[PDB]
Design a protein around this ligand. Structure first.
Ligand SMILES: CCCCCCCC(=O)O
Length: 210
């Protein structure tokens, strides 16, 4: 009936990952409610299950020399970027076998958040994540272990979208990336974006936030 929200603020990717794993263990054990972690990461490139070297424009060493951290991870999708101004959410939820349904629910929650800003967004029939026209507003890539999810979504609120240019997604996609800031012509407070995400999750999943 409930889900727990934890706002971690700004957290390095590696430590946040370790925290995801600890939260995940507790949810698997039935010793913690379904938990939505909300946070930001310092500039980082991650490479998921479908990622290859082709997804990096420069060598890995260039990224580390130029202010990015870089990690290979087990979530769905290929390459992505997280940085300040991007609201990262990790729903660590007991989804069982129904992962496709879970993805659709994350998508729906993000579509609701965009609608709250007067923005028409859609999952699209063909591209992972949530899109506004030809541009990706929110990336989505999860992992599921022992029936509990981790990783999650990355909603561009005030992201430096220029940082996406150095990575090269593969497969079916639209043309670009966008953010609430870009669509609205002004920065949106991160505290507010978090609140709207919590409300949307509460509505879509039918759970009370604590
Ligand atoms: C925490 C969210 C990470 C989303 C990665 C998506 C990459 C892709 O769609 O290829």
């Amino acid at each position: 009936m409930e889900f727990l929200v934890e706002d971690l603020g700004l957290v390095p990717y590696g430590e946040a990952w370790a925290y995801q794993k600890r939260v995940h263990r507790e949810v698997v054990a039935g010793n913690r409610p379904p938990t939505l972690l909300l946070l930001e990461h310092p500039r980082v490139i991650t490479l998921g299950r479908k990622a290859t070297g082709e997804n990096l424009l420069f060598p890995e060493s260039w990224y580390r020399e130029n202010g990015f951290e870089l990690y290979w991870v087990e979530r769905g999708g290929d390459v992505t970027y997280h940085g300040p101004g991007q609201l990262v959410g990790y729903p660590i939820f007991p989804v069982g076998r129904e992962v496709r349904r879970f993805l659709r629910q994350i998508e729906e929650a993000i579509v609701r958040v965009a609608a709250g800003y007067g923005i028409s967004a859609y999952p699209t029939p063909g591209y992972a994540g949530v899109w506004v026209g030809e541009d990706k507003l929110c990336a989505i890539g999860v992992a599921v272990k022992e029936g509990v999810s981790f990783h999650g979504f990355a909603l561009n609120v005030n992201t430096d979208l220029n940082d996406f240019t150095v990575i090269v997604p593969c497969g079916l996609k639209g043309k670009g990336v966008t953010s609430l800031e870009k669509l609205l012509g002004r920065k949106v407070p991160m505290e507010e974006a978090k609140a709207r995400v919590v409300a949307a999750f509460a509505e879509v999943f039918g759970l009370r936030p604590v």
